[PDB]
Structures are given as structure tokens and as C-alpha cells.
Amino acid sequence: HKSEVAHRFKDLGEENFKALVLIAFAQYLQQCPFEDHVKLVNEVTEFAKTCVADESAENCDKSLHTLFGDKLCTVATLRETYGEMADCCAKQEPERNECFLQHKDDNPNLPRLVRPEVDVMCTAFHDNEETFLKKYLYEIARRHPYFYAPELLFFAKRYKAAFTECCQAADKAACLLPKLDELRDEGKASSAKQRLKCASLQKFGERAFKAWAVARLSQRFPKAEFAEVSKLVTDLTKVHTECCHGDLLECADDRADLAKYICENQDSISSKLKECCEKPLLEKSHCIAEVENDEMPADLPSLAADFVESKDVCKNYAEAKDVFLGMFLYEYARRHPDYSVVLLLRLAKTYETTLEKCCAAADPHECYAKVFDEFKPLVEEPQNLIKQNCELFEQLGEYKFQNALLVRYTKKVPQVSTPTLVEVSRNLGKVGSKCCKHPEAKRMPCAEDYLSVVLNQLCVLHEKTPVSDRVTKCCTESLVNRRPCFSALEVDETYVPKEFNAETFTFHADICTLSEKERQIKKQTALVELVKHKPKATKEQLKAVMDDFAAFVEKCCKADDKETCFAEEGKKLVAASQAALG
């Protein structure tokens, strides 16, 4: 009351307050030294302490955004570091924060993190343990500006536990890398997942996220009531709205309240929350967000009884057009847990469109009576796509599956930059190794919910530099229909060939001097360049040049001495390929 910062300090505490302010500062001013961020956080914490000690102190009743902006731009006073940012904080709330959000670089030009030796890492750990953990938050926060802040506090705790457990014992080297690598891959998957949730609130509105939350939570929490699911959805939407507009202090405070409420009303929500609700505060919310789907309630009546066979459907729709569709989404999702969340949203939109033109055109009960008949093609379209791709995946392997997707997606949109095409196809091919081994029931909720994340990552890296018109049309037209739009484009008859570049196929030594993961990009980039060279003459039989590439690589890999072999066989191979018109 009368002091939001004091209330946040009292709720979160001292350790979480200082960590949640460092993340906020690092996610805004990405190209800034660590020491300045530490000083700013210390000043903010001291001001919060002074306002806590005496309520009627110097002015501290203003909102957190005002203090955030004042400490942000009225103290740093850097203009050359961030362009067009000097005039950013000339407006008032809430226009200042909106201007600040648009300057967050999704892919900043920062050096890749390199891990020192274990001995040096744990020598620095047990020298400034408080400061050593603060640097971990800074780098992750500045490299992922949209990373979920309350989830970043869990990762720091796991980092501290991993460092404490291993190198205060024998075999320091082979204890830390296995566990640190788990965090790195777990942190890159929870940052791309939040980006999809965070770009669906500021591009498609709050109503888009509410329907997603209703569909997802009804699947995870069946046998509950619509009143409870609505409350959970409202709380979740309020939580995720604040983390997207920079209110990290309030976002982490509201998440704890939601977790506490879920644990309190455990019997009325789900029976699988017994274990997740006996964990520490930072682990309860993580466990709840990933709890498994509860068992379906027994003897559920058919949905056709009160949605298509009753002469009040359009009357109820006209009474309230946003809760009637909420009930349909809730009832159709609880009894169909094998559908992806984006499919259920598609069927809900189809049902809404059918109802729109039925009660406003002559007899109503003549065109929405068979609305369930047109759900079949929508259901069968992605079931006939996962089935073929998983079969194709388990006949070529991971590396050859990524190449197959890379060639397919290069002909569809042959204008995106080669690094973006290579990166998206590498992530596209990793859904085969992820959950093509699941049973047919669980294949759909996993595959499409990951394809959505990958395609959103494709869209956000294309908005800054829009080069392809087809990508723009599929990205900024509908969130749910993003995947069907991409898997509906034929080969592009436009995009006259990129001509021939001699320097492209000039593999000179290296290749066989470093690890295998990053040498694959050296060949996938060449494949992308080859496909763009001949977009039309891209039949399957002329793509046998991959075998020649592999043979040429192997011949000089086993004969690394006299590195002129690389150039000689490279020019011979490119001449042979050009002579074959392929």
C-alpha cells in the first residue's frame, strides 16, 4: 500500500529482489559493462530499503516503471551505444516502456560464451561466490532478452548446486561438464518457448493468449470445472503479460501466488500435483508448469448433445460470444488430449466461423448441424504429415533428415539469408530425433508444439530484415495457421537463379581439424548455395552430388598432408558438376 517497491521487497525478499533487478537491467541495456549494472542494482536496492524503513521518506510512491526508466536512461547517459535511444525516454508512461521494448535485440552481436577449465572455474567460484553467480545471470539475461525471469532464478540455483556438488570432491573435471551441458541446452529451449508465448501477446493480442491457455490447461487439468480453469487462465495471462512488458518484479510475485493457490486447491484441480507441491518455492512453479496430464474423467457425454443438437446454440452465442466459445474449447480439449494445442484452436475458429453465418441466415439449424463433419480434414492434415515425416526420418538418420528438410525449405522460400535457412532447418530436423519415438497418441502434441516454436523463431529473425514476401504472409496472418501456411507452399517459379560464384565451392583445408557438429554447417551452407543456384533443376536424381562432396571431403581428410589436394580435387569436382548441368 502506497509503495509498490516496498511491497515487492517485502514479498520477494532480499536475494530474489537483487537478482530480479539485475535481469531487468541486463535485458534492456544489453551492450553495457557488468560493473555498471551491479552499481545500478545496488542503488535500486538501497532506495528500496530506505523506502521500506520509512514509508514517509523521500518520494517512493511512484510506480516501478517510473523508477526503472529513471535509473535506466537518466543515469547511464549513453547514446552512441544504443541508436535512437536518446529520444526514447522523452515521453511518459506507458509510452516510455513501449519504446524501450522495441530496442531489445533478439539476436545481439555478442561473442559466444566459452567455458574455461574446471580448475579455473572453481577457483573463481570459491573466491567471490556471490559475484560469480551474478555474472551467470548477466550473460544469459543479455543474450536472451525475452527469457522467463522467474524461471531464470531456478537455473541460477541449479548452477550453484552443480558447482557446489562436484568440484568440492574428487574428479572435478568429469562431474561438471555433464551437468553444465544439461543447463545450456535446457536454457535454450525455455527461451524459445517463452518467445512464442511473449510474441503472441504483443502481436496478436491478449485474446490469442487466453484461448491458448484455456486449451492447454484444460488438457492438463481435466475433470475440473470451467470456473476453476477460467480463474487459472486469468491468473496465468496476468502473470505472462507482466514479464513481456518488463515488470519482472511483479511477474515473479504473481507466479508465486498462483503456485500457492494451485497447491491449496489441489483436490479441485488435479491428482498429479502431490509431488510438485512439496518442493521449495522456486521448484514448485517449475514442477506445476510441466506436470503431466491427468486421467480423463469417466463417462463424459457426447459434445453433440448441447452444441449442435439443441435449439439454443446461436442464442447462447449471441448472449455472450466469448464464454460460449470458451466452453467449447474447454469441453473439446479435456476429452482430446492427443491433439496439439494449435489444432484445438483451429477447430474452435472453424466452429466460430460456422456459427457466425448460421443464426444470421434463414433457418439456423441447417448449416451448423453438420459442423463436426468439417473437423475431419483439419484433424487429418497434421496426422498425415507427422506419419510420413517420422517414417522418412527413420530411414536416413538425423544428419540426412536435416539435409532433406533443408533442400525442401530452400525451394519454398529461396530469399531468406543462408545462415537463417541453415539454422531453421537444423532445428526442424531435431523434432524427428525428439519425439518420433513416442506412441502415436503422444506424437501430435509434441511435434506441432515444437514446429510452432521453430517457425516463430524463423519469423522473429525475419521481421528485422524482411527479404521474402512468402515468409511475411505466413508469419503475420494467423498464429494458429502458421504451420499449415508453411507446409503449403510449392516451388517458387520466381527468384531467377543466383548465378555462379567461384569462391563458394572453395573448401581449403580445415574441415577435419575440429569437432563434427560445426563442420556439418560448412557442408549444409554449400548445399543451400547449390539449391539456390539451380532452383528449377532440382530433381531428386540430380542431387547425387552429395556423394561426390562426401568422397572429396574424405579423400583429403585421410590425406591431410599436401593440402593442395583440397584445391585440386575441389576444382576438378566443381568442373565435373558444372559439366553435368546439375
Ligand X SMILES: CCCCCCCC(=O)O
Known binding residues are: 1, 4, 11, 65, 238, 242, 245, 247, 250, 253, 257
Out of 187, 222, 246, 432, the only residue in the binding site for ligand X (CB under 6 A) is: 432
Window 267-326: residues binding ligand X (CB under 6 A): 280-283, 285, 288-289, 325-326
Asked if 447 touches ligand X (CB under 6 A), the answer is: yes
Cβ 160 to ligand X shortest distance, Å: 6
Asked if 487 touches ligand X (CB under 6 A), the answer is: yes
Residue (of 332, 375, 354) closest to 226 by Cα position: 332
The mark string for 146-165 relative to ligand X (x by CB under 6 A, - otherwise) is -----------xx-xxx---
Torsion of CA 523, 529, 533, 537, to 10 degrees: 50
Residue 68 vs 351, nearer CB to ligand X: 351
Residue 72 vs 531, nearer CB to ligand X: 531
H helix intervals, 225-374: 226-244, 248-264, 281-289, 313-319, 324-334, 341-356
Q: Within 10 A of 397 (CB to CB), how many other CB atoms are there?
A: 13
Q: What is the Cα–Cα distance from 178 to 162, expressed in whole angstroms?
A: 10
Half-sphere exposure of 91 (CA within 13 A, CB side): 11
Q: What sign has the CA pseudo-torsion 297, 301, 304, 310?
A: negative
Cβ 389 to ligand X shortest distance, Å: 4
Cβ 325 to ligand X shortest distance, Å: 4
- Asked if residues 390 and 432 have their Cβ atoms less than 8 Å apart, the reply is yes
Cβ 428 to ligand X shortest distance, Å: 5
- Name the grid cell of 174: 568429469
Residue 60 vs 288, nearer CB to ligand X: 288
Q: Which stretch binds ligand X (CB under 6 A): 256-264, 266-274, 354-362, 535-543?
A: 256-264
Out of 152, 262, 444, 573, the only residue in the binding site for ligand X (CB under 6 A) is: 262
Asked if 528 touches ligand X (CB under 6 A), the answer is: no
Out of 345, 358, 406, 526, the only residue in the binding site for ligand X (CB under 6 A) is: 345
Summarize the annotated binding site for (4Z,15Z)-bilirubin IXalpha as residue ranges.
238
Asked if 255 touches ligand X (CB under 6 A), the answer is: yes
Out of 37, 210, 426, 482, the only residue in the binding site for ligand X (CB under 6 A) is: 210
Asked if 348 touches ligand X (CB under 6 A), the answer is: yes
Asked if 259 touches ligand X (CB under 6 A), the answer is: yes
Instruction: State how far the alpha carbon of 285 is from the alpha carbons of 253, 270, 338, 401, 485, in Å.
Output: 12, 15, 24, 36, 35
The mark string for 361-400 relative to ligand X (x by CB under 6 A, - otherwise) is -------------------------x--xx----------
Out of 149, 196, 198, 211, the only residue in the binding site for ligand X (CB under 6 A) is: 211
- Asked if residues 290 and 283 have their Cβ atoms less than 8 Å apart, the reply is no
Summarize the annotated binding site for Zn(2+) as residue ranges.
65, 245, 247
Using CB atoms within 10 Å of the CB of residue 369, give its burial: 0 to 12 exposed, 13 to 18 middle, 19+ buried: middle
Out of 26, 431, 527, 574, the only residue in the binding site for ligand X (CB under 6 A) is: 431
Helix (H, G, I), strand (E, B) or coil at 462: helix
- Asked if residues 398 and 429 have their Cβ atoms less than 8 Å apart, the reply is yes
Q: What is the Cα–Cα distance from 486 to 386, expressed in whole angstroms?
A: 15
Residue found under cell 530496442: 103
Asked if 471 touches ligand X (CB under 6 A), the answer is: no
Asked if 505 touches ligand X (CB under 6 A), the answer is: no
Please tell me the chain's helix, strand, coil percentages from 3-state DSSP, rounded to the nearest 5.
Answer: 65, 0, 35
Residue found under cell 474423467: 297
Residues forming contacts to ligand X in the complex (CB under 6 A) are 157-158, 160-162, 179, 207, 210-211, 214, 239, 255, 258-259, 262, 280-283, 285, 288-289, 325-326, 329, 345, 348-349, 352, 386, 389-390, 405, 428, 431-432, 447, 451, 486-487
